[PDB]
RNA sequence: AAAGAUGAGACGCGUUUUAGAGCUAGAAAUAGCAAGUUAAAAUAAGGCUAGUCCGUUAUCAACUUGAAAAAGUGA
DNA sequence: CGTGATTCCAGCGTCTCATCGTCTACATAG
DNA sequence: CTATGTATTATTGGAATCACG
């Protein structure tokens, strides 16, 4: 337990781990076995792999949460409507709302009459005859002037309020702006603005061209083609694009330097148009407004298919048109089918199982499915021409409520609602008094920047209230503080400072932040003239003069300006040499110049007084995006500026946030000096310390205060991992990796390893770079051959040394940053002590390897992997990672800085790359000359052609002399390790969480498996759910009554506690089980069993718990290494990137060892007979193997790779041997595992607790 | 620039039970014909903290001391 | 009654907002 | 190493049914 290394392979569903020693060998130990078994210890190799289900994202959970909120709020608005109608409805029908609430119940459970609207059969039939759909009643109430029944009024208004349409269009809308007329007026406006360049709209059918249901760009192409001499990218073309909904840029048409993209749907369009008009002039506003009108026209013409002058209800009229055409076409279709195809009539109009009209109306068939089913039937008959035209138009036998009604904006429903209220407020005073209340109920939306209207019990809410009361759609503006809420909406998701976790970060365009950047860059600027002797820092006076004379007069400050406008003008230097800045100063004072342009008061900007004002203004311009809220917030400073300045300030807006808070820049001060960070940046004697120096100076209290303020935690590992940027699945993997490393360190007596290697899921000679991609005579094809992608062409025509070092690095370094974070976590956990110079003592080196390294190693030295055989390949990948990484760092220690985490010296490879010498390059201190850091592993290397260079058997480090790779002794070690059959494969047991059951609301069925959707909704009458998800099973040992005599009988069985049942069972298990039917339960014998709990039965047969009523295969099939390599080589039969002679040798090995095939089959059968127990499936598999014995070896090997599904760990799965389909043999009973041996495994599986369940019993 | 991650506000369907008096013929399970497009209510059971809030992400071998939280146990 | 074999099946589309980090290249520092 | 700046797709448990003992 002294000197060892750990190799790790982190994945989305698995973490492979391995422990290696000095000689790249995997140790083995005797681990104690706890429990009541006859085995008290077991032998374990220190190598394995942890398997686990994928980590899920929160997307589905959030979508269901928002759906819940939307259903709640829709119910609430309907309740508001009923509350408004309460008293007058009670005067009309005291039980109308009651019946509308008990509509779902059956008549047995109904407390009032079964007819909802009128409470008697005659009036109900009369209403359904007079108004066949709700839209007929909507149109009638819109158009008629007669007094109407208050109940029908409520029904129409409630249908509109319950389903109100989208809110994607801002402002009011009317069918007055419905395509030819608005196109004509747009053309008139364009020709008015552009007299000299008029456009001809004659013969250009705008309605048909712009309303053809096709893509937008295609409609634009069609319309532009109708205008000769005009282009899609022209001004009129851009207007047609803006009207169609595309995003055109008017930067080319009006000759601009900024890119002003305009889209009508975006919320910024109001401000975007004002921006463009500030660049082009207000005389074009009319034009863009006409364009918007045209867009409205297109949308409304696509939605409304009726004349908008005959009725004020165009949408209801279009729905009634749908209904009438449906009626007529169904009559015609029934007649035609009765006449021509009479045998299909029953199938079409009575078989809900078929996708005919019967399955289209009463079955689950969709409109698309019905069209696909009935198109050939229409084609076979006569008189179906118009029906087929309507079918190909997706307009045949349509329903009123369909998937595309998502186009309807809330303005249309609101117009119809307002029309009804206008018509009926003449007869009902309460309607006239509450008209705006009802319209507000329909229109009101909680702004996205407000969030949930909570009162201190929602972790999602940030809204703040002006008064603490109930919030209604009518008092929202008075109770909710929209300003503070939209401030929090942004500040919840803004980063805090890395040094101060309690202080919000500054805006990026903050004057304080820009001063910080400028001064931090300016302190480190040095200058030398011919007179002076040494580089000199800029004093505080010099920095102040440079800031006042250059940064406050220019937007960008160049080094030429620093030399001429200051060192020459002020210091009177004719020649100055400036370092610390190359061509120009990266930092600049942009917001300073912007505000100087806007307010035109330099003394206001330079007075360190108005700062807090200016800062706040910039904050207001960044924090908020709504113009009205920006105005409301800047109203406090209105008295400081002119109203013109106030408007120009409103129009200015910024985006972006910095990395440092206001406190660190200017808040905290050094104790003895009393100066902030910016004060030291303005003047720090002759040291001119910068941010990093200041916060990391032990002679200042900045460092100590930063360490104190780091009281956000004292922080949890789960929190550090959770806060990382990445997918939740890889984060689950990282947490499992850290826990595995902790357990492995504890296994070695808390001894820390030497290294930890982590890996996360020939034109140019292969001696230089093993690039086998699309992009890929000596180094390159010779010049004579050249005479006879861009990177590909450059490498081909390159006919190096620096590119060789670049290859060395590209073959080596891991650019992915999540791996850097994993390395930092492991390193900070391992290395915690500091030396005499207070620098970290890296006892453990954390190495990061690319998967390409171990992949190439496997392919070069024939340690092939076959992922379909078993799960060992993860552990093998971890072991190979350990081996390759440790050997690689021992061979070339100078490359530490490239792949080992930590601040180390970056001495590079240009020195290590030898000269053109090869024979002396291996003797000199230059590390090596050939450009593959993986060449020292081979005994011979081939720079293409036939010139084979040779390497020694033993490879060592040149300087230290430590042996790094004995080619005679280490490859055999790797082979023996990869051949070990005992590998610790542990499937992470997990309690099942999530949705209670299957979301499908099933019909009524006489089955106890049905789950009531409400307490009182007996599923035998109302249907319900089935298929619950078992959170975990429970081993119960108790007695149940039996027979009519209720005699107690001892039992031992598995009860599946569902996710819905979990909290009730955990609150009191005894009462839960007794309610389930068990009596006298041994509470101490209750065993909780999560999914994938492991049992061992007879002859080593293992099973994992899939649920309380199903099991999964629990054994691994350890196939010998020779069969694995044979399967790899035989299944490929493709060029293995190796020399054609090596390919021929591998093909000859494949053909010489064909008998292996049979042996593999045998190896499967012996396994299945022992463990799988799928007699019919195994017999079918054997017959299929004997059937295709004449097939080529490659295809037989591929289908054997397929065969391994029968023996894999986990859930059974169907597979195929050629064309033979083997269905899954499932273990539909968990009765056996009640008497087997339960195995509780630690995360590595090295620690076990075995419980003989046969001991448990009530006799 | 997009992806992804996270949060917020909305829209449209889907599904369930009920209401849409089916008629005629026979001793009759039933048969023939007619009809079908719409609505109401629910949309995780529910919780208390009673909000126009929350309820499907993350985390979880065994054992021991343990209000609980945390550690400790085994070549 | 039970066990094995064999089917069958599983809520999903659309839009509007916002923030974050990925990702290399220099330069200053720890 | 770190901090700051400029530059689109299957899977697998529940449920039922049917043969067969
Ligand atoms: K979520
Ligand atoms: K959804
Ligand atoms: K609810
Ligand atoms: K889980
Ligand atoms: K849990
Ligand atoms: K929509
Ligand atoms: K909805
Ligand atoms: K008859
Ligand atoms: K659901
Ligand atoms: K486990």
Numbering used by the authors: 2 to 179, 181 to 716, 718 to 764, 840 to 854, 867 to 878, 893 to 903, 909 to 1368
From the manuscript:
Cas9 is a CRISPR-associated endonuclease capable of RNA-guided, site-specific DNA cleavage. Formation of a complete R-loop leads to the activation of the Cas9 HNH and RuvC nuclease domains to catalyse cleavage of the TS and non-target DNA strand (NTS), respectively. Here we report a series of cryo-electron microscopy structures of Streptococcus pyogenes Cas9 capturing the directional process of target DNA hybridization.
X-ray crystallographic analysis of the 10-nt match complex at a resolution of 2.8 Å confirmed that the TS and NTS remain hybridized at the PAM-distal end of the DNA substrate. Here, the PAM-distal dsDNA duplex forms a continuous base stack with the sgRNA–TS heteroduplex. The PAM-distal duplex is wedged between the REC3 and RuvC domains and the L1 HNH linker. The relocation of the PAM-distal duplex causes the REC2 domain to shift closer to the binding channel and occlude the cleavage site in TS DNA. This shift also establishes new electrostatic interactions between a negatively charged helix in REC2 (Glu260, Asp261, Asp269, Asp272, Asp273, Asp274 and Asp276) and a positively charged helix in REC3 (Lys599, Arg629, Lys646, Lys649, Lys652, Arg653, Arg654 and Arg655), hereafter referred to as the DDD and RRR helices, respectively, which are highly conserved across Cas9 orthologues that contain a REC2 domain. The HNH nuclease domain remains docked on the RuvC and PI domains in the 6-, 8- and 10-nt match complexes, with the active site buried at the interdomain interface.
